[PDB]
Design a protein around this ligand. Structure first.
Ligand SMILES: *[P@@](=O)(O[C@H]1C[C@H]2CC[C@@H](C1)N2C)c1ccccc1
Ligand SMILES: [Cl-]
Lengths: 212, 215
């Protein structure tokens, strides 16, 4: 299929320049009708940033125009967004998207990448177990910054009964999140349960076994 | 971020219909085609309707749109638990730039379900690092309103916990909630009984789950 993939999430300091790329697979970037970016501040709606058309002409959101550059790199088959002089009001999930042919109805979207603009610094999490006819068990992913973390169970084999909660921002300025799952109590002695934690901003991956 | 106005939320039971309105002005909706998107939690928007009333391939005819004047409407019939999501309208403005509504969350109504409650002591691994987090989980309840009270040696805790709630479950329409009580290690070791007491419409009286440190 056509797939779009934004570069990874992280942190940008205020006044500095946010730089994102979107790798396109399954379609030649130079053939696309337009490529662009939209963002979504946390708990809010969508906001268009800008687009670049097949011609090379760009159109940007007038409120952002002085700070935005969108360009295409045909050797990498990717397009980019640079947003200069950022502030906390630029904190958002950024999506890349494109309409590959002008006759298409649906654009192809990326998955979104959260960029946090903050004077705080990147910190990886600690992962602690929440040890267990039904038993609950989980992982506590504590003391990380910025968002997000992802959590899977058993390398994606275990999905039923999993609940990964929104993170909370502690008074320390660091996030904490829990992920839990409910399983049969009989399985505790025979089935291994591992939570797979990824904090892309700090490049921290941990696979934590949770023992009864 | 938003330009067009949508209600914050709509709700109905499975099998029922909801409509979601999107109100604009003569220079956006009044002059331009409206599109609608569904955003399941943690995913990108997905097109439901374009050119006011057309469905792209893959979208079933339970979704429909229309436009009248400076307003548009999305209809969803035959509601399923999978339709729990945020919905957005979009159009172009007088400069032919894309603009969005602020989103409407769709909640699916279901029967009352009491939470199952679990408490987790701090791990030895965390206590070795100097801190103690006690976690209380309220699993798969409905409706969303729930109250957790922490007690430490019968002292009601106020202000030293934080909680969060899942989006509505895509299969059974329930919520789950996690609450963390944080103490220092030194404080955790001064007290014995840690308790989470839960009040919910599904419970005829509050449920308490507790443990004694080190027992
Ligand atoms: P939406 O993301 O646009 C879709 C549907 C139609 C119109 C452009 C392209 C992608 N398709 C050809 C949209 C439309 C208007 C405002 C905001 C979003
Ligand atoms: Cl689309």
């Amino acid at each position: 299929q056509v797939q779009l993939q934004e570069s990874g999430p992280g942190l940008v300091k205020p006044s500095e320049t946010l730089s994102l790329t979107c790798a396109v697979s399954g379609y030649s970037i130079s053939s696309g009708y337009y490529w662009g970016w939209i963002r979504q501040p946390p708990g809010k709606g969508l906001e268009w940033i800008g687009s670049i058309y097949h011609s090379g002409s760009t159109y940007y959101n007038p409120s952002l125009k002085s700070r935005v550059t969108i360009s295409v790199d045909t050797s990498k088959n990717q397009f980019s967004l640079k947003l200069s002089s950022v502030t906390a009001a630029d904190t958002a999930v950024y999506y890349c998207a494109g309409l590959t042919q002008s006759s298409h109805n649906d654009a192809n979207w990326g998955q979104g990448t959260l960029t946090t603009v903050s004077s705080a610094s990147t910190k990886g999490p600690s992962v602690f177990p929440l040890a267990p006819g039904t038993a609950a068990l989980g992982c506590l992913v504590k003391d990380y910054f910025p968002e997000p973390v992802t959590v899977s169970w058993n390398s994606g084999a275990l999905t039923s009964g999993v609940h990964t909660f929104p993170a909370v921002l502690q008074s320390s300025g660091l996030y904490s999140l829990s992920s839990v799952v409910t399983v049969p109590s009989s399985s505790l002695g025979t089935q291994t349960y591992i939570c797979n934690v990824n904090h892309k901003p700090s490049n921290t991956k941990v696979d934590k076994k949770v023992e009864p | 971020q938003s330009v067009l106005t949508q209600p914050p939320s709509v709700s109905a039971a499975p099998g029922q219909k909801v409509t979601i309105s999107c109100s604009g002005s003569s220079s956006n909706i009044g002059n331009n085609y409206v599109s609608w998107y569904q955003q399941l939690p943690g995913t990108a928007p997905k097109l439901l309707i374009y050119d006011n009333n057309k469905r792209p391939s893959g979208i079933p005819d339970r979704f429909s749109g229309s436009k009248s004047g400076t307003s548009a409407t999305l209809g969803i019939t035959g509601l399923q638990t999978g339709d729990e999501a945020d919905y957005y309208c979009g159009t172009w403005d007088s400069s032919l730039n894309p603009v969005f509504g602020g989103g409407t969350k769709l909640e699916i109504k279901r029967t009352v379900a009491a939470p199952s409650v679990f408490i987790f002591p701090p791990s030895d691994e965390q206590l070795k690092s100097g801190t103690a987090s006690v976690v209380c989980l309220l699993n798969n309840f409905y409706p969303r309103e729930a109250k957790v009270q922490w007690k430490v040696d019968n002292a009601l805790q106020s202000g030293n916990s934080q909680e969060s709630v899942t989006e509505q479950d895509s299969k059974d329409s329930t919520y789950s909630l996690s609450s963390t009580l944080t103490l220092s290690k030194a404080d955790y070791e001064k007290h014995k009984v840690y308790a989470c007491e839960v009040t919910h419409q599904g419970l005829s009286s509050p449920v308490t789950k507790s443990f004694n440190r080190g027992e």
